[PDB]
Structure 1
Amino acid sequence: FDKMQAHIGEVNGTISIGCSSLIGQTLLPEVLSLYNAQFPNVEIQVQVGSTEQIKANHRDYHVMITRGNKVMNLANTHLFNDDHYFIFPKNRRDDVTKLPFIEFQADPIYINQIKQWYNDNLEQDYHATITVDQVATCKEMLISGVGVTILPEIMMKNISKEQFEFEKVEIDNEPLIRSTFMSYDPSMLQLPQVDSFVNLMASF
């Protein structure tokens, strides 16, 4: 009990984390809650923004968690890959082309991939008839029955399997995926609050 408290107390100081949008909304809060419980003496600083923003501000952070590609001159730990699903009301299989497509703001390489897939699979020109700034707005539009969309798996929690059909997105019989990486200077692992965070996040 003395040594348990000793270790808990021991890990302290500050950790600054930069995290991309989707994971920041869905998984980070849970991780941070667990991290505060296990390591109450460390002060957290967090930014959640687009991958591009976080990568631009890399000097602000001990650790970055981003969707896209590895960051050069840093260690990169692969956390997971995400598949993507075309989602539409189950009751409406046939006339999917007539429903508005809901587009959320994201990396332009990603959007152009989605557009391509739409062209080739609905055999009709892609048009974002509903365009939104925030992913949760996209999800709310979907859930309320207003349209169809494509979401990565991480955003698909609490979407009724009873109400909606899910079609895995593939381009030239290759699943559209995005990888998420945790990136840091390896020497930052000598800080115990950072080492602790990195192993906790990687264990999810």
Structure 2
Amino acid sequence: HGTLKLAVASIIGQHWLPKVLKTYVERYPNAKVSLITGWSSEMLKSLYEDQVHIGIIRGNPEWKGRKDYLMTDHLYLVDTEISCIDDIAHTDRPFIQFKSDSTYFQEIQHWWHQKFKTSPKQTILVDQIETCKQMALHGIGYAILPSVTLEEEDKVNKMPLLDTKDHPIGRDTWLLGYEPAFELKQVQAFVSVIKDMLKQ
């Protein structure tokens, strides 16, 4: 029962993985866990280069190994004052806007263009989603966040992002590895903890 090496997308590492690691540690005391985090592209690279056993990756990664769908969450435009999502096309509050090399940024641009037929205000550009949340909780402006980072208790208005046909805009999260990893007892225990937690 050796060391489990994980490469996990940042918002997952922050918001979803802790509860999984709690159960993993509860069932397997003193099992060693090594965790790196970051952009999805970076964690995929790490997994591709044999540096970890398992990647948890968002988006739609192409992968010639084992790939398990985990979950989907949906985008919300959050703000402290604005209550109605149509006002966002006129307000003077800045668009705090996450941007990495994933498709998250492009897809919000596409939604904005289609819904409002205008372009959004490239004022504040941030390279990590959690800083967007924080900056938005502090009233600086509004933000578009995946619901995996939101809680009901968050003092901020929650406005569903819907496409032109009123369908919530989603993002997927996958678990990825090559066959040798899945033969390891600690990888298998971790996967088993995950596929337990998904039914909750």
**TM-score range, shorter-chain basis?**
0.7 to 0.9
Q: 1:104-154 CA distances to partner (integer Å, 9 max, x unpaired)? A: 233352212211222232343212322222222211121122211211110
Does structure 1 retain, via aligned residues, the 8 Å contact 2:160–2:168?
A: no
* Structure 1 residue 29, shift from structure 2 partner: 2.1
Asked if 1:116 is matched to 2:110, the reply is: yes
* Structure 1 residue 90, shift from structure 2 partner: 5.3
- Structure 2 residue aligned with 1:181: 174
Task: Please give the alpha-carbon distance, in whole angstroms, between the structure 2 residues aligned to 1:34 and 1:182.
Answer: 18
- Structure 2 residue aligned with 1:40: 29
- Structure 2 residue aligned with 1:192: 185
Match for 1:192: what amino acid? Answer: K
Unaligned runs of 5+ in 1: 1-11
Asked if 1:25 is matched to 2:14, the reply is: yes
Asked if 1:56 is matched to 2:51, the reply is: no
Task: Please give the alpha-carbon distance, in whole angstroms, between the structure 1 residues aligned to 2:60 and 2:102.
Answer: 14
Task: Please give the alpha-carbon distance, in whole angstroms, between the structure 2 residues aligned to 1:91 and 1:56.
Answer: 39
* Structure 1 residue 171, shift from structure 2 partner: 4.8
SS of alignment partner, residue 34 of structure 1: helix
Indicate the structure with greater helix content.
1
Task: Please give the alpha-carbon distance, in whole angstroms, between the structure 1 residues aligned to 2:71 and 2:196.
Answer: 11
Match for 2:100: what amino acid? Answer: A
Asked if 1:132 is matched to 2:119, the reply is: no
Task: Please give the alpha-carbon distance, in whole angstroms, between the structure 1 residues aligned to 2:19 and 2:13.
Answer: 10
- Structure 2 residue aligned with 1:167: 160
* Structure 1 residue 172, shift from structure 2 partner: 4.8
Q: How many residues align structurally?
A: 191
SS of alignment partner, residue 23 of structure 1: helix
* Structure 1 residue 177, shift from structure 2 partner: 1.6
Structure with greater Cα Rg? 1
SS of alignment partner, residue 100 of structure 1: coil
- Structure 1 residue aligned with 2:78: 87
Unaligned runs of 5+ in 2: none
Q: 1:9-46 CA distances to partner (integer Å, 9 max, x unpaired)? A: xxx21111111111011111222222122112321111
SS of alignment partner, residue 111 of structure 2: helix
C-alpha distance 167-72 of structure 1, shift in aligned 2 (>3 A)? closer
* Structure 1 residue 174, shift from structure 2 partner: 4.1
Calculate the TM-score normalised by the size of structure 1.
Answer: 0.83
C-alpha distance 200-24 of structure 1, shift in aligned 2 (>3 A)? same
C-alpha distance 66-129 of structure 1, shift in aligned 2 (>3 A)? same
SS of alignment partner, residue 103 of structure 2: helix
* Structure 1 residue 91, shift from structure 2 partner: 5.1
Match for 2:142: what amino acid? Answer: V
Indicate the structure with greater strand content.
1
SS of alignment partner, residue 57 of structure 1: helix
Match for 2:56: what amino acid? Answer: I
* Structure 1 residue 166, shift from structure 2 partner: 1.3
Task: Please give the alpha-carbon distance, in whole angstroms, between the structure 1 residues aligned to 2:10 and 2:102.
Answer: 15
* Structure 1 residue 76, shift from structure 2 partner: 0.9
User: Which shifted more, 59-68 or 109-118?
Assistant: 109-118
Q: RMSD value over aligned CA atoms?
A: 2.1
